[PDB]
């Protein structure tokens, strides 16, 4: 991009008669930055010269005087033509720290060739030297840095959702020069720019909060959905195209199974509802045999979403264990578990 602006004048002779305006044009890729000062002399005469300083930051690339190179001739001469409405324009390479930048001028018109020696630098000293216009002016802007350094988002390790359930998480995104791209920012999977296989539910939303982003990730969760996990990623650019994580970073790390900056895993579980009707036993803390099945029927009854798929090896019988405490274990088509204690359905009949 590039940026246009009109400079702090830092200040300017009354004595002076011959700035009209200045301005500034800084290409961020290049990082050059443009001073670009229009003249309109009193005495045009037929020689033109500046005395230019600019700040340490910078370093000369390019003068033009109306439209042509300078002659080359802490401040540099630099002579060109003299017209009216003349446009001195002088480029620099601003170092990768940017900061403020500053420009000095001294300039004069002469009807002879003007020299170093020969140029006044107070109004009461021209009609000795140079013997035309004058002026003397100072200006500054500031710069942004070159910014090298990736964003950093911060999500959790782990976001995990239920079949039937609705989830917000969100990630935050941090940048050193606190500015984004939010065009390039998303929630994927490693193969497209998509939510991913057995995940089209994921959604993601993008909001600047001061300065940083958030990235709500929600959905909707289908009853019809596998159980597991899988590995998805926020990808987040700067203002300046840094991100996160490349596209091949993503892909080492899905071969590798190690991490990136941004990656998180989906874990899809079930979400266990409790029987309506209390399961009646002898005592709650030791069950029977018997007992122990009437739990696990209870369990599965009030949860008939709770597929033979959806259990370790697709088997009722070891994918819910019932201890004889009435603690029942589910153990998931991932190994994953619930374990979950039975005082709140499991009642003793003694007193009912
Ligand atoms: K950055
Ligand atoms: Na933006």
Redesign the pocket.
């Given at each position: 991009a590039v940026t246009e602006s009109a400079p702090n004048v830092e200040y300017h002779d009354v004595k002076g008669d011959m700035i009209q305006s200045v301005t500034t044009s800084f290409d961020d890729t290049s990082r050059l930055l443009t001073w670009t000062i229009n003249l309109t002399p009193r005495q045009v005469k037929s020689n033109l010269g500046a005395l230019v300083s600019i700040s340490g930051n910078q370093e000369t690339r390019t003068v033009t005087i109306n439209g042509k190179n300078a002659a080359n001739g802490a401040w540099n001469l630099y002579t060109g033509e003299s017209v009216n409405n003349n446009v001195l324009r002088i480029t620099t390479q601003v170092n990768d720290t940017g900061g403020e930048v500053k420009l000095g001028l001294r300039l004069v018109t002469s009807d002879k060739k003007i020299t170093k020696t020969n140029l006044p630098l107070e109004f009461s000293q021209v009609a000795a030297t140079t013997n035309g216009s004058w002026d003397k002016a100072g200006y500054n802007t500031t710069i942004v840095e070159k910014d090298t350094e990736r964003p950093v988002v911060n999500v959790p390790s782990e976001i995990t959702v239920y079949r039937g359930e609705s989830f917000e998480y969100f990630a935050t995104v941090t940048d050193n020069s606190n500015?984004?791209?939010?065009a390039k920012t998303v929630v994927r999977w490693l193969y497209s720019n998509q939510p991913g296989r057995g995940t089209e539910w994921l959604q993601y939303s993008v909001t600047?909060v001061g300065n940083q982003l958030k990235v709500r990730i929600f959905g909707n969760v289908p009853i019809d959905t596998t159980i597991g996990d899988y590995t998805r990623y926020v990808v987040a650019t700067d203002?300046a195209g840094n991100v996160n994580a490349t596209q091949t970073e993503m892909g080492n790390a899905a071969v590798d199974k190690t991490s990136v900056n941004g990656q998180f895993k989906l874990i899809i579980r079930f979400r266990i509802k409790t029987p309506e009707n209390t399961v009646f036993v002898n005592n709650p803390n030791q069950l029977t045999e018997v007992e122990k099945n009437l739990v696990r029927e209870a369990v599965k009854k009030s949860n008939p979403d709770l597929r033979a798929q959806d259990v370790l090896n697709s088997n009722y019988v070891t994918g819910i264990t019932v201890s004889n405490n009435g603690t029942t274990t589910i153990t998931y088509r991932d190994g994953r578990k619930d374990i979950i204690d039975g005082s709140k359905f499991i009642d003793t009949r003694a007193g009912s």
């Open positions: 500015a984004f791209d939010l600047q203002a």
